[PDB]
Write a protein that holds these residues in place. Structure first.
Motif, PDB file in Angstrom:
ATOM      1  N   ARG A 167     -13.328  10.568   5.763  1.00 55.26           N
ATOM      2  CA  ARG A 167     -11.920  10.605   5.387  1.00 55.26           C
ATOM      3  C   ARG A 167     -11.192   9.362   5.876  1.00 55.26           C
ATOM      4  NH1 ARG A 167      -9.211  16.286   6.881  1.00 55.26           N
ATOM      5  NH2 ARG A 167     -10.964  16.679   8.298  1.00 55.26           N
ATOM      6  N   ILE A 168     -11.574   8.847   7.043  1.00 56.44           N
ATOM      7  CA  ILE A 168     -10.962   7.628   7.563  1.00 56.44           C
ATOM      8  C   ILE A 168     -11.273   6.457   6.648  1.00 56.44           C
ATOM      9  CG2 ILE A 168     -11.476   5.857   9.289  1.00 56.44           C
ATOM     10  CD1 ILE A 168     -11.024   7.942  11.422  1.00 56.44           C
ATOM     11  N   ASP A 169     -12.533   6.339   6.229  1.00 58.12           N
ATOM     12  CA  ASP A 169     -12.891   5.248   5.328  1.00 58.12           C
ATOM     13  C   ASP A 169     -12.150   5.373   4.002  1.00 58.12           C
ATOM     14  OD1 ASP A 169     -14.333   2.852   4.922  1.00 58.12           O
ATOM     15  OD2 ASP A 169     -16.107   3.745   5.858  1.00 58.12           O
ATOM     16  N   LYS A 189     -20.896  17.473  14.924  1.00 60.48           N
ATOM     17  CA  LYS A 189     -21.467  16.514  13.983  1.00 60.48           C
ATOM     18  C   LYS A 189     -20.806  16.634  12.615  1.00 60.48           C
ATOM     19  CE  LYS A 189     -26.112  14.700  14.834  1.00 60.48           C
ATOM     20  NZ  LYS A 189     -26.413  15.048  16.249  1.00 60.48           N
ATOM     21  N   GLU A 190     -20.654  17.866  12.124  1.00 55.49           N
ATOM     22  CA  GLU A 190     -20.078  18.071  10.800  1.00 55.49           C
ATOM     23  C   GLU A 190     -18.674  17.485  10.721  1.00 55.49           C
ATOM     24  OE1 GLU A 190     -17.829  21.352  11.128  1.00 55.49           O
ATOM     25  OE2 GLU A 190     -16.630  19.960   9.926  1.00 55.49           O
ATOM     26  N   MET A 191     -17.810  17.857  11.665  1.00 53.47           N
ATOM     27  CA  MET A 191     -16.422  17.428  11.585  1.00 53.47           C
ATOM     28  C   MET A 191     -16.284  15.944  11.900  1.00 53.47           C
ATOM     29  SD  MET A 191     -13.062  18.743  13.663  1.00 53.47           S
ATOM     30  CE  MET A 191     -14.059  20.155  14.141  1.00 53.47           C
ATOM     31  N   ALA A 192     -17.167  15.391  12.737  1.00 52.71           N
ATOM     32  CA  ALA A 192     -17.147  13.954  12.986  1.00 52.71           C
ATOM     33  C   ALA A 192     -17.488  13.180  11.721  1.00 52.71           C
ATOM     34  CB  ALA A 192     -18.125  13.605  14.109  1.00 52.71           C
ATOM     35  N   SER A 193     -18.537  13.602  11.013  1.00 48.48           N
ATOM     36  CA  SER A 193     -18.869  12.951   9.751  1.00 48.48           C
ATOM     37  C   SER A 193     -17.724  13.089   8.755  1.00 48.48           C
ATOM     38  CB  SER A 193     -20.153  13.545   9.178  1.00 48.48           C
ATOM     39  OG  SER A 193     -20.074  14.958   9.110  1.00 48.48           O
ATOM     40  N   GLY A 194     -17.125  14.278   8.682  1.00 50.94           N
ATOM     41  CA  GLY A 194     -16.012  14.475   7.768  1.00 50.94           C
ATOM     42  C   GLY A 194     -14.848  13.550   8.064  1.00 50.94           C
ATOM     43  N   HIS A 221      -1.556  14.480   2.531  1.00 45.69           N
ATOM     44  CA  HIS A 221      -1.690  15.391   3.656  1.00 45.69           C
ATOM     45  C   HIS A 221      -3.144  15.814   3.808  1.00 45.69           C
ATOM     46  N   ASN A 222      -3.531  16.100   5.048  1.00 47.32           N
ATOM     47  CA  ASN A 222      -4.892  16.526   5.351  1.00 47.32           C
ATOM     48  C   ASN A 222      -5.177  17.895   4.745  1.00 47.32           C
TER      49      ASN A 222
END
Lengths: 49, 231
Positions: free
Chosen positions: A19-21, A10-15, B230-231
């Motif tokens: 970041r994508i947006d 959940k944490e990394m999916a939200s992150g 970069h990420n």
């Protein structure tokens, strides 16, 4: 990589979603900047040449 | 008043003569001749005018009573963008060795002053005093490349000051300078991306991206692109 626990998932999916947006917004802004500067260039490119 | 060529040459010669005495050079700083002199040099092409102006610059930079006055004159010239004109003149070839020697001396003095300004202590003092006005240090490639780590000094005090300026400052020039500095720090030290994100500078930069002033907006866009490279 991938998560090892549902909490990490959940944490990394939200992150990554946030970041994508953010990257989409930055992409649109930079493309608009390119379009504006290129329009300005084309306004007078012949006279410069 | 933009007099004729002969009048301009005579006035330039008078200024050059007056610059010989260190006291006169120190006193004349109030008039700020350097800007008008550089403008005349750029506009005109007469060899006599160019030689007189270059000799006047050499006299001002050599007869200055104090290193403080010398640095002030060098900064005035750099801000007036006399370095590029001097480089172009040096690329151009003349006959008299006097012109070449004057050009070389002026270029050397300007470069030394530019390095002195690019010294990281200058950046720290400017940040402390809120002097974000596109100084030579703000764009010195070597300065950012070899001193970005120092930005973390004082427990990231420099980064905290930059973030506070980016958040509170309403002056478009100050905001643009802060954004450009943040972008330079990110570009020259990738490890600082996490520090910036923790400080929240990413959110402030993104918000300023759509700022009213286009001058601030361009710097904000550049900084955002550098941060998200970069990420």
């Amino acid at each position: 990589p991938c998560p090892e626990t549902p909490q990490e998932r959940k944490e990394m999916a939200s992150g990554v979603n946030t970041r994508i947006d953010d990257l989409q917004m930055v992409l649109n802004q930079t493309e608009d900047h390119r379009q504006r500067v290129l329009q300005a260039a084309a306004k007078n490119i012949r006279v410069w040449f | 008043n933009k007099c004729g060529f002969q009048l301009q040459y005579q006035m330039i010669f008078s200024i050059w003569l007056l610059a010989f005495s260190p006291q006169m050079c120190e006193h004349l700083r109030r008039y700020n001749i350097i800007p008008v002199l550089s403008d005349i040099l750029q506009e005109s092409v007469k060899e006599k005018v160019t030689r007189i102006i270059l000799a006047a610059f050499r006299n001002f930079l050599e007869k200055s009573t104090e290193r403080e006055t010398r640095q002030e004159y060098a900064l005035a010239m750099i801000q007036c963008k006399v370095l590029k004109q001097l480089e172009n003149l040096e690329q151009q070839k003349y006959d008299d060795e006097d012109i070449s020697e004057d050009i070389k001396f002026l270029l050397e003095k300007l470069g030394e002053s530019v390095q002195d300004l690019s010294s990281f202590d200058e950046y720290s003092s400017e940040l402390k005093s809120g002097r974000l006005e596109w100084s030579p240090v703000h764009k010195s490639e070597k300065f950012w490349r070899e001193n970005a780590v120092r930005l973390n000094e004082k427990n990231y005090e420099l980064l905290k000051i930059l973030t506070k300026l980016l958040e509170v400052s309403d002056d478009p020039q100050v905001l643009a300078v802060a954004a450009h500095d943040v972008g330079e720090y990110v570009r020259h030290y990738p490890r600082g991306k996490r520090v910036f994100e923790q400080l929240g500078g990413k959110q402030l930069v993104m918000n300023h991206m759509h700022h009213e002033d286009q001058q601030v907006r361009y710097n904000a866009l550049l900084a955002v692109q550098k941060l998200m490279v970069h990420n």
